[PDB]
Amino acid sequence: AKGDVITLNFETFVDSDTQVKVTRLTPTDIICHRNYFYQKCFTQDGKKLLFAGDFDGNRNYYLLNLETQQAVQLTEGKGDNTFGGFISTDERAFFYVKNELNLMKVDLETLEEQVIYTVDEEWKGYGTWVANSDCTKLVGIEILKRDWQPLTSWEKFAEFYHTNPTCRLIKVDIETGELEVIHQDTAWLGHPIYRPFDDSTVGFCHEGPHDLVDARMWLVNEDGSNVRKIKEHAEGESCTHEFWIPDGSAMAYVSYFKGQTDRVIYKANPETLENEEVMVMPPCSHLMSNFDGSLMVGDGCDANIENDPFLYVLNTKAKSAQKLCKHSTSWDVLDGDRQITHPHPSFTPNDDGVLFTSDFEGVPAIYIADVPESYK
């Protein structure tokens, strides 16, 4: 029940291949996972952590006190989207979506909840809400209910893309609760993201197969004008995994050229709109950077070869990737949920560690791998 407290045991072990220290935060007998890597889950001091677990028979949100090893239940009941959740800039509250209908704001102190927005009967919420740096406005996208189709299989994926569904990129005001359509279109839109310290810019993209798609690297101003593509897109080049670097210095992404058998990370200037290569990309699924983009972490995955179960800590400046420790996750889909099993590596607020999920000990749990100065 909302408000309850649970005392956890932190067990630290040494990785057999890198000697790097790794500590498990959650029990090995109950399902737990971290939120999406681009969403804030750590307080600046690095003492509080937001995460999800089934302690109360339901996938709910908890706030873990790293120095007390005690976690308090933030939300109760069923219907929580345990991935999109995030902590406010003032760290006095976190936001999450319940029943895919109501955007909630929760006081981390009183645990009081406030529904700040409720999707209209005409639309369907899609993607994850992303707050602006000041945490006064939220951006997101929605799909016209009539145009909505359940994406069951890949056959249904491409199918939906061609149905050219009408989607809109909206902006909601935390204070007023009023929505403002900043961009609409009869195309499948997605992944809306406010430019870190610049409410002016809002990056979004076109969903669908990376092949039969014009381009996904899109940008548009808050007012709704200057809709443009981040990169010109070279014939044969596919871009993905885009994400704003925390400080807002640039839009980092990964591109792959057919016939080059090599993936390379790229940084795009939000203002100059000029892209530039940064370094190679080891075989990884997700990619997240440091605050300034000087460090990056990656998810080793599957390509007589061999599946890569390692986490990578890339050094932007030195342009060098290095194996940190091992996550050894079974990318299995639990109860239709394909994301709980994803490591979703993210740096700790001061870069001394990397938080990630894994089910190698049997069930999905949360770990924090230390990150030595040599970036081992």
The CB-nearest residue to Mn ion is 342
For Mn ion, the closer of residues 34 and 231 by Cβ is 34
Cβ proximity to Mn ion: between 168 and 342 the closer is 342
Does residue 327 have a known ligand-binding role? no
> Which is closer to Mn ion, CB of 127 or CB of 270?
127
Angle among Cα 286, 288, 292 to the nearest 5 degrees reads 165
Output 267 or 342, the one with its CB closest to Mn ion: 342
Residue length, the chain?
A: 376
Strand locations in 45-197 (E): 48-53, 60-65, 70-73, 86-87, 93-98, 102-107, 113-118, 123-131, 137-144, 167-173, 179-185, 189-195
Q: Return the number of the residue (33 or 124) whose C-beta is nearest Mn ion.
A: 33
Give the total of residues touching Mn ion (CB under 5 A): 1
Smallest distance, Mn ion to C-beta of residue 34, A = 11
Per the annotation, does 339 bind a ligand? yes
Tell me the closest approach of the beta carbon of residue 303 to Mn ion, in angstroms. Answer: 17
**How distant, in Å, are the alpha carbons of 183, 195, 267 from that of 81?**
25, 23, 30
Whether the CB-CB separation of 161 and 208 falls below 8 Å is answered with: yes
By CB under 5 A, which span of 71-79, 214-222, 233-241, 340-348 interacts with Mn ion? 340-348
Residue 267 sits in the site that holds Mn ion (CB under 5 A) = no
Cross-strand bridge partners of residue 107:
93
Nearest approach in angstroms of CB 286 to Mn ion is 5
- The Cβ of residue 124 has, within 10 Å, a number of other Cβ atoms equal to 18
Q: 251 forms bridges with which residues in the sheet?
A: 244, 268
199, HSE (Cβ side, Cα atoms, 13 Å): 13
Q: What is the per-residue binding string for Mn ion in 141-180, x denoting contact by CB under 5 A? A: ----------------------------------------
- Label residues 229-238 b or e (16+ Cβ within 10 Å = b): bbbebeeebb
Subset of residues 341 to 370 that bind Mn ion, contact rule: CB under 5 A: 342
| Residue 342 marked as a ligand binder | yes
CB of 291 to Mn ion, least distance (A): 21
Amino acid occupying residue 54? D
Residues contributing to the site for Mn ion (CB under 5 A): 342
Residues at the binding site for Mn(2+) are 286, 339, 342, 344
